[PDB]
């Protein structure tokens, strides 16, 4: 009944629709393989805040070094669907 | 920083494995291969009533009747309130009335 | 969770991991989403303050005083996901994550009452036994000669190759069992 | 019984829980205004508290000096 | 009792104050109107405290039943930071919620009109303790503003859970347990304290303070935690304080209590006992 | 099994090789092994592990044993069992412990002096003692018939 | 303004200065104990993830401090003036105390029984 | 004196029912949580039967339904006081488990 | 089965119903459906039993036994007499538990009628309880547990020296 | 699947958010989480709740109860 | 109330304590005093099942009242009526003892007043 | 649909 379960399109949905909310994050070159550094040209405290919108929305915690680990929303994706074992 | 090559392959591989796993939890349609309802105050609730209840009822009033009023002391109840211009079923006097009441200020 | 903890935490490390302590007690502190974002910008705008800095003594001695300022001004009660450790729901399930291994000791009837995943099963207990000695040899040809070594472990280097040590990792029991 | 979910917006409230819920508050509010006018025992009694100051020596039995 | 029952309801109150999970909020509710009865006890008044048994029993049932239904549609979600708006997205369960704190707080004619209010009269007018009637009066103003707490925290203010609707109590297995336990928070007291056999003859020529004390002090609760809610709603970060962290901490008796006596325990217990 | 006497504990190390052979049997570097001190109390080489519970462990890591918080082959506390999760804590706390066990004994006595204090100032309203007939109820109360009460006399007011 | 560490509530690892001026042999000495923790790590996962394993794992480390806290104790115990002074009290005092204890209130019910000033109403069933 | 005594250990027994259900081997073919609950507003309602009698007559009763063993001068035996509190105290209670078991049915769901 | 003699039970006055207002009582309404549905087919099953039951009658008898010599008049070290007496006084001690239990249950009778006069209307009830129990103190208390016949004789004994002493002023 | 609403439509303007905005910009500081936290104050969840609006839930109703019982109960005597 | 504060503030002399209430004769200022009379006797008390605490001088609008309810047990809102007249002499027995506190301490000032005289 | 198996010990025993 409640509690839908997730997709790896939703999930990699929410986390584009965060970062589209974002406002360093220009949408137009935001991408799911575009790097934190790289290409979107944040630095650490972005990515932990990055990290945190992305624990509020999904309501569960990612740990410290896992989360410096992320650094791109492929990789976030990844995270969240091997977190709550989401397959398709 | 960000992930080295060696544990991005390591966990790209794993979590592929993972969703093939996760798949293979699947169960197929066949799966598990096991080997009057009128409406609910006629049948659900009167079945109940006349079964799980009036069948005990029998079996406690039984046990009651039959097996504690032959013993002394089991059932033993308070005396019941009497009161003025009552008249007592079992000795058949009635009780005299009170006073005058000489307060009626309310 | 998915990456071991190394020798040391890094100051930049100890840094994020204390800025983003400082948020989450900010937010505990705050509840409102106006007032938590004003707050959380001005914490911001002090660690940007602070950013700039060369000497690294002063840098770390900053740390120290800020951390001492956050243990003096931390929430007695400080917001926690269920899930989190010192959670509600956290090792809610761990009464419910049956390990795979009993389905090696379930009746025949019991694996009759579900023959395909079975079937599945031993094709995943056959790979397991094809792979088991290649990622022991793996193992033990990556093995620094030097006694350093860390609790990471290498992928598969070659195609048809799995990558060492999976079994424990790709079946675990499910957060949501049932 | 089952609702599509929302992502940010208001969830689409059902007719009966709202109904329901009204309705039960508003028996509240009626059984409380009801008792309120039929029995204001609430406030201030109804036995007239009396001040012991105002009592007077002759009724309350002291010798005069 | 009377000096027990007063100090462990002003102690619970205090407690209660300032914990953001709903379910320790209504336990140190409960607790503190546990010390009520026992102060009740006190007195000599058990028919009063029994009577408080039955209509505590149904504020409690309801209110917890209201804060698990709001737990499983915020999905095993259950402090109150995290919480808000369920006035307008869960309008069952915020109706029967302002059931219960209201009638848990002693809004008259309801339930708990007939066991607290009675209780009040009882204190201010019988021969007890000065300071346990001073707490108990207090340990009453705070059950108000605790309940005020959970009243504005969650049905009250803006949303702050995570965005992901997954509200639905339109089961009626949910539903009708909430109608019949309302139906008793609401009718119960009422129907039984008339039903009572009278006993325990109480005072009713009082003062008109001391009568409406219990609504005073209800009602002096319920605005001094509203003003401090919007105090906390008003942009600034103020510097806590010893009370506050006595309060939130549990009175620190949990944690000096559960570390000393456990640690001594088993600490003898090892190194004197088996060893030596 | 394959557990011999060279594993298992022994006496208490008096050599620097004998505290590097207890390192090595302990799994632990030589200055990282500090065995309890000769009281004679049993301990002999068994190492001082610091005196922190299993919660002060990390609980993203997972450990080998998950629920004690440790993992294998690494060595045990002598106080494990004391110091389990669902057992003794020494965790930090938000507020000193000397500050908590000054607070909550100041409340307490402070509490036990006010209802002292309520206890030789009572408070109670401005009435006299209840009236009750029949020689304060003698007969109900269980006195004996057969001998007369002093009689209890009370006066309209 | 400081926090104090106690015994029961210690000293947290960030408050402590212990990791601030931080020196080259303490972060070798890290590294070192990284190096062991990987390698016991490494062996226990082969152990664990082993197919061809029919059985538990046996852990050594408990083996041991089961070994220390039931065999070891007397073989490296020595009598000590301060261990034998502990277990002296240790094993007396409370047996004397509590028997100074019951023998006075024994003599004193004693007592008020043969002078008959304890009164037993309905006491039949001792 | 009859009917009284009945409604009390048939409350009693109509508890004790579902217990020796989930033991008699056929949960699986009914709904247990439904059949409890089913089981705990009927108790709800010949616990009400003696609510009404009390609040009639306000008779206090005890009942001496077993008896347990004797001890030399003292008997242990299995007995009930029916007290005003006893009676309302049963009431309450089962129309509050009853509105907690239907809460626990919707609630313990994919458990 | 039980008899008044010994199970006392003053006769019951319930008052005359006198209803006042005009709702029908519902206690009087499920009290005729409760025996026009259960009592009536229960008090049948219980007369085919009953009817069973004489249609196979049997009889059983309670035993007495006659009275041995008592320890007093029984020589010390002649075992057989010892062992008569010792068994006899057995037999009275669980007599005297028995008769402990049933004075007990009158009291406790006493106290559920009354209620809220058990105060004053169980004062013989009261009194015979502290007769009887001063006399089992008298006779029983403090043996120990190997009470026997010559334990009881010694504390009787030295009761009555007691009070032989005490009598002399 | 499900879809999500246009990200586009998340305005911070009449808001609390912008009233924390202002207070940042007279101290020269930009708030960027505030588009992503302006969804709770938009739409539906746009609006005051009351303390009085809470407790008089239902009052209309309730008296409108009460008066018609009256009136009953008034034409009954 | 004031009473309180003047005992524990002003003086103890003048203002009393409840357990010595009458610490005066019931004849000094009343040349003849009434005794306090009764309707109920104890035989109905004992019939009507009060308990000890409510065996005061209402028991007879309590017997009332009791008997109303075991009459009327349908429709319990029956007799507030009688309820209220219970209510009211359990307020005059209120009122009573508040006369004899007020009668005792207006005669302990009266008995400083005679020591200051003397 | 999409159900999922649930990995249970032996209960037959
Ligand atoms: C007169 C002039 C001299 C005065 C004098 O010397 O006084 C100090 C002298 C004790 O000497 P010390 O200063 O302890 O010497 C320490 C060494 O210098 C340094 O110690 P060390 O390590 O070189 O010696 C090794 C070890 C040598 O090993 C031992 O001592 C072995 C332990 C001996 C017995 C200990 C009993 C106490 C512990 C009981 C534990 C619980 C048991 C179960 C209950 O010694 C000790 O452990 C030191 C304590 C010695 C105590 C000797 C007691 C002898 C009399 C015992 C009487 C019976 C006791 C109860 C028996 C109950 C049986 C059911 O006497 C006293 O203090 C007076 C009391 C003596 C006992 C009564
Ligand atoms: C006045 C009152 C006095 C007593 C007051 C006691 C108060 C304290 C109660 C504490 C209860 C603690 C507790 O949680 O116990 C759980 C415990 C069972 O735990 P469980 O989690 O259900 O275990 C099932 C397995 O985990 C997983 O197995 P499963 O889920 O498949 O369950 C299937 C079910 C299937 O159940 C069975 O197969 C029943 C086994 C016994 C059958 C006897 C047939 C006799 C036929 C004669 C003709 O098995 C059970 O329920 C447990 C099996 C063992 C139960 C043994 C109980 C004693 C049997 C004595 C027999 C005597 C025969 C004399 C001749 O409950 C009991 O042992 C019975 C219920 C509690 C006592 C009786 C009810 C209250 C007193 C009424 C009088
Ligand atoms: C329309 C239909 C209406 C139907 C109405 C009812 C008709 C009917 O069935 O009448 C009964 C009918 C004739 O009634 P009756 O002849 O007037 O009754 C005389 C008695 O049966 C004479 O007694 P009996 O010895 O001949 O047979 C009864 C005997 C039967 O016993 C046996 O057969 C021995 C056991 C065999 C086990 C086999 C496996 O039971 C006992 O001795 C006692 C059983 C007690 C069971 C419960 C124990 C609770 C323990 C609680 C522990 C905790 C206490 C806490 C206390 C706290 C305060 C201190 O049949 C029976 O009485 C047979 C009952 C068979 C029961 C079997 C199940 C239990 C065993
Ligand atoms: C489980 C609940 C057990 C309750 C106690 C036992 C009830 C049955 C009982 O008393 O059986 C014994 C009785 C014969 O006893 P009696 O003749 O006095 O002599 C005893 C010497 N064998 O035997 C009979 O009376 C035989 C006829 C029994 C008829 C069925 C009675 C079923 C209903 C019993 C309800 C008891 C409820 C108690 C609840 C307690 C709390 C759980
Ligand atoms: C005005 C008048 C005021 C008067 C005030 C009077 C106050 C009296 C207080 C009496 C009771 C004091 C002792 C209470 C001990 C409770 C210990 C306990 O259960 O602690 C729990 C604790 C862990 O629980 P916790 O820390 O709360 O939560 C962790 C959650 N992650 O730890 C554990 O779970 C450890 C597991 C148990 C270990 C063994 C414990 C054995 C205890 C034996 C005690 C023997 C003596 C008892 C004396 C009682 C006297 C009343
Ligand atoms: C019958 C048997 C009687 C046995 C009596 C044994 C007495 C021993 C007295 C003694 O030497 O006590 C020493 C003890 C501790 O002193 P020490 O041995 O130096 O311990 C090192 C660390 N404290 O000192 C103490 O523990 C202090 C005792 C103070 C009293
Ligand atoms: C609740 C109470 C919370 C109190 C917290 C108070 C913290 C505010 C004070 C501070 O921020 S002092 C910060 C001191 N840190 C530094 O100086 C680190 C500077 N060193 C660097 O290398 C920095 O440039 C960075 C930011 C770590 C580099 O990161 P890059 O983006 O990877």
């Known amino acids: 009944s409640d509690a839908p379960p997730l997709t790896l399109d939703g999930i990699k949905d929410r986390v584009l629709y965060v970062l589209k909310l974002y406002d360093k994050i220009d949408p137009e070159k935001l991408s799911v393989n575009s790097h934190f550094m790289k290409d979107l040209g944040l630095d650490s405290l972005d990515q932990v805040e990055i990290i945190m919108a992305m624990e509020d929305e999904f309501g569960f915690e990612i740990p410290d070094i896992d989360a410096e680990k992320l650094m791109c929303p492929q990789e976030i994706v990844d995270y969240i669907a091997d977190k709550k074992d989401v397959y398709e | 920083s960000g992930y080295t090559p060696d544990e991005k392959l390591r966990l790209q591989q794993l979590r592929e494995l993972r969703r093939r796993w996760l798949k293979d939890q699947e169960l197929s349609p066949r799966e598990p291969v096991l080997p009057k309802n009128m409406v609910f105050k006629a049948y659900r609730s009167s079945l109940f009533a006349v079964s799980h209840v009036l069948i005990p009822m029998w079996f406690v009033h039984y046990y009651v009747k039959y097996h504690m009023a032959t013993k002394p002391y089991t059932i033993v109840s308070s005396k019941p309130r009497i009161f003025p211009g009552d008249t007592i079923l079992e000795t058949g006097e009635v009780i005299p009335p009170m006073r005058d009441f000489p307060d009626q200020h309310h | 969770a998915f990456c071991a903890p190394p020798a040391y935490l890094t100051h930049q490390q100890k840094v994020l991991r204390l ?87 379930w009746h025949p009837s019991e694996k009759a009452m579900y023959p395909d995943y079975f079937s599945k099963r031993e094709q995943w207990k056959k790979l397991r036994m094809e792979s088991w000695d290649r990622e022991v040899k793996q193992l033990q040809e990556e093995t620094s000669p030097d006694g350093i070594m860390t609790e990471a472990l290498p992928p598969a280097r070659r195609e048809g190759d799995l990558p060492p040590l999976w079994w424990h990792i790709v079946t675990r029991p499910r957060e949501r069992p049932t | 019984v089952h609702i599509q979910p929302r992502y940010r917006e208001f969830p689409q409230l059902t007719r009966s829980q709202v109904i329901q819920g009204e309705f039960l508050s508003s028996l509240m509010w009626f059984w409380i205004l009801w008792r309120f006018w039929h029995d204001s025992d609430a406030v201030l009694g109804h036995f007239s508290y009396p001040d012991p100051s105002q009592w007077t020596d002759e009724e309350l039995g002291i010798p005069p000096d | 009792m009377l000096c027990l029952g007063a100090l462990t309801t002003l102690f619970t109150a205090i407690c209660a104050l300032t914990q953001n999970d709903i379910k320790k909020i209504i336990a ?48 095993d979600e259950q402090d109150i930071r995290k919480m808000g708006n369920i006035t307008k997205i869960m309008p069952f369960t915020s109706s029967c919620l302002v059931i219960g704190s209201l009638a848990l707080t002693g809004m008259p004619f309801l339930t708990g009109f007939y066991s607290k209010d009675l209780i009040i009269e009882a204190i201010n007018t019988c021969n007890t303790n000065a300071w346990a009637l001073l707490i108990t009066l207090i340990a009453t103003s705070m059950t108000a503003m605790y309940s005020m707490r959970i009243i504005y925290f969650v049905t009250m203010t803006k949303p702050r859970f995570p965005p992901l609707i997954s509200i639905n109590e339109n089961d009626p297995d949910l539903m009708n347990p909430i109608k019949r336990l309302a139906f008793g928070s609401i009718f119960a007291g009422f129907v039984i304290s008339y039903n009572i056999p009278p006993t325990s003859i109480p005072v009713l020529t009082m003062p008109w303070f001391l009568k409406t004390t219990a609504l005073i002090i209800s009602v002096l609760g319920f605005l001094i935690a509203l003003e401090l809610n919007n105090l906390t709603m008003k942009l600034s970060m103020n510097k806590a304080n010893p009370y506050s962290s006595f309060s939130t901490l549990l009175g620190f008796f949990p944690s000096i209590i559960h570390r000393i006596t456990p640690m001594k325990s088993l600490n003898l217990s090892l190194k004197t006992s088996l060893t030596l | 099994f394959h557990m011999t006497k060279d594993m298992l504990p022994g006496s208490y190390p008096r050599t620097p090789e004998e505290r590097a052979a207890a390192a090595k049997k302990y799994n632990m570097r030589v200055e990282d092994y500090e065995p309890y001190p000769d009281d004679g109390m049993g301990y002999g080489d068994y190492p001082m592990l610091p005196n922190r519970s299993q919660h002060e462990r990390d609980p993203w890591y997972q450990w080998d044993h998950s629920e004690l918080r440790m993992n294998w082959g690494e060595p045990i506390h002598w106080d494990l069992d004391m110091y389990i999760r669902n057992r003794v804590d020494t965790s930090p706390t938000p507020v000193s412990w000397d500050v908590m066990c000054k607070h909550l004994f100041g409340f307490v006595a402070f509490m036990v002096f006010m209802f002292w204090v309520g206890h030789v100032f009572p408070s109670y309203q401005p009435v006299g003692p209840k009236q009750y007939p029949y020689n304060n109820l003698y007969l109900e109360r269980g006195g004996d018939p057969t001998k007369e009460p002093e009689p209890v006399v009370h006066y309209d007011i | 303004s400081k926090y104090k560490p106690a015994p029961l509530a210690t000293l947290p690892s960030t408050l402590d200065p212990a990791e601030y001026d931080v020196s080259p042999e303490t972060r070798r000495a890290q590294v070192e104990r990284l190096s062991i923790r990987a390698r016991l790590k490494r062996e226990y996962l082969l152990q664990y993830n082993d197919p061809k394993r029919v059985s538990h794992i046996e852990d050594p480390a408990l083996i041991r401090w089961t070994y220390a806290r039931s065999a070891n104790i007397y073989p490296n115990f020595r009598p000590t003036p301060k261990n034998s002074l502990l277990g002296a009290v240790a094993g007396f005092g409370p047996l004397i105390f509590w028997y100074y204890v019951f023998k006075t209130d024994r003599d004193r019910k004693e007592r008020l029984i043969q002078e008959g000033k304890l009164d037993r109403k309905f006491n039949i069933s001792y | ?94 129309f509050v488990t009853w509105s907690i078991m239907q809460f626990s049915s919707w609630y313990m769901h994919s458990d | 089965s039980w008899d008044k003699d010994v199970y006392p039970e003053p006769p019951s006055r319930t008052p005359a119903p006198s209803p006042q207002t005009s709702l029908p009582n519902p206690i009087t309404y499920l009290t005729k459906a409760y025996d026009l549905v259960v009592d009536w087919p229960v008090t049948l099953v219980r007369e085919f039993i009953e009817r069973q039951h004489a249609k196979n009658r049997t009889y059983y008898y309670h035993r007495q036994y006659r009275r041995v010599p008592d320890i007093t008049e029984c020589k010390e070290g002649d075992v057989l007499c010892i062992y008569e007496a010792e068994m006899q006084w057995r037999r009275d001690f669980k007599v005297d538990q028995e008769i402990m239990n049933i004075i007990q249950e009158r009291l406790k009778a006493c106290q559920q009628r009354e209620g809220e006069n058990y105060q004053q209307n169980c004062a013989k009830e009261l009194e015979q309880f502290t007769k009887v129990t001063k006399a089992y103190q008298d006779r029983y208390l403090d043996l120990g547990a190997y009470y026997s016949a010559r334990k009881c004789l010694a504390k009787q004994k030295q009761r009555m020296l007691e009070e032989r002493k005490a009598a002399r002023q | 699947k499900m879809e999500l609403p246009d990200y586009r439509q998340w305005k911070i303007e009449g808001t609390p958010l912008e009233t924390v905005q202002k207070k940042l910009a007279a101290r020269g500081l930009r708030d960027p989480w505030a588009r992503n936290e302006a969804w709770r104050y938009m739409g539906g969840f746009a609006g005051n709740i009351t303390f009085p609006s809470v407790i008089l839930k239902g009052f209309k109703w309730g008296f409108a109860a009460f008066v018609v019982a009256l009136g009953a109960e008034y034409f009954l005597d | 109330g004031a009473h309180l504060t003047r005992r524990y503030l002003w003086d103890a002399s003048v203002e009393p304590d409840p357990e010595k209430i009458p610490s005066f004769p019931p004849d000094l200022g009343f040349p003849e005093r009434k005794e306090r009379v009764m309707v109920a006797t104890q035989q109905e008390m004992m019939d009507a099942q009060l308990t000890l605490q409510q065996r005061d001088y209402c028991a007879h609008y309590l017997i009332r009242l009791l008997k109303c309810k075991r009459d009327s047990f349908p429709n319990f809102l029956a007799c507030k009526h009688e309820q209220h007249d219970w209510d009211y002499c359990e307020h005059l027995d209120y009122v009573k003892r508040m006369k004899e506190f007020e009668r005792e301490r207006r005669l302990l000032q009266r008995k400083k007043r005679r020591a200051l005289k003397e | 649909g999409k159900r999922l198996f649930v990995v249970k010990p032996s209960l037959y025993y």
Request: aromatic fraction near 16%; charged fraction near 15%.
């Open chain 8, 1 to 94: 004196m009859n009917i009284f005594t009945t409604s009390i250990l048939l409350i009693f027994i109509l508890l004790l029912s579902p217990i020796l259900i989930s033991m008699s081997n056929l949960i699986k073919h009914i709904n247990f949580p439904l059949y409890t609950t089913t089981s705990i507003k009927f108790s709800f309602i010949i616990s009400l039967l003696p609510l009404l009698m009390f609040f009639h007559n306000n008779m206090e009763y005890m009942i001496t339904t077993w008896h347990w063993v004797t001890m030399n001068s003292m008997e242990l035996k299995m007995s009930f006081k029916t007290d005003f509190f006893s009676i309302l105290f049963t009431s309450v209670a089962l």
């Open chain 3, 19 to 105: 800025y983003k302590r400082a948020l989450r007690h900010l937010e505990s502190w705050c509840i409102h989403r106006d007032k938590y974002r004003y707050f959380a910008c001005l914490m911001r705008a002090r660690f940007e303050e602070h950013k700039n800095e060369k000497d690294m003594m002063r840098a770390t001695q900053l740390l120290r005083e800020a951390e001492e300022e956050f243990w003096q001004n931390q929430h007695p009660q400080p917001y926690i996901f269920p899930d989190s450790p010192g959670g509600t729901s956290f090792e809610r399930y761990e009464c419910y994550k049956v390990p795979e291994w009993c389905l090696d000791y």
């Open chain 5, 28 to 75: 140190f509710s409960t607790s503190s109107q546990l010390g009520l009865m026992m102060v009740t006890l006190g007195m000599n008044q058990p028919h009063l405290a029994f009577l408080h048994i039955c209509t505590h029993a149904f504020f409690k049932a309801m209110l917890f039943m209201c804060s698990g239904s709001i737990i499983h549609s915020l999905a």
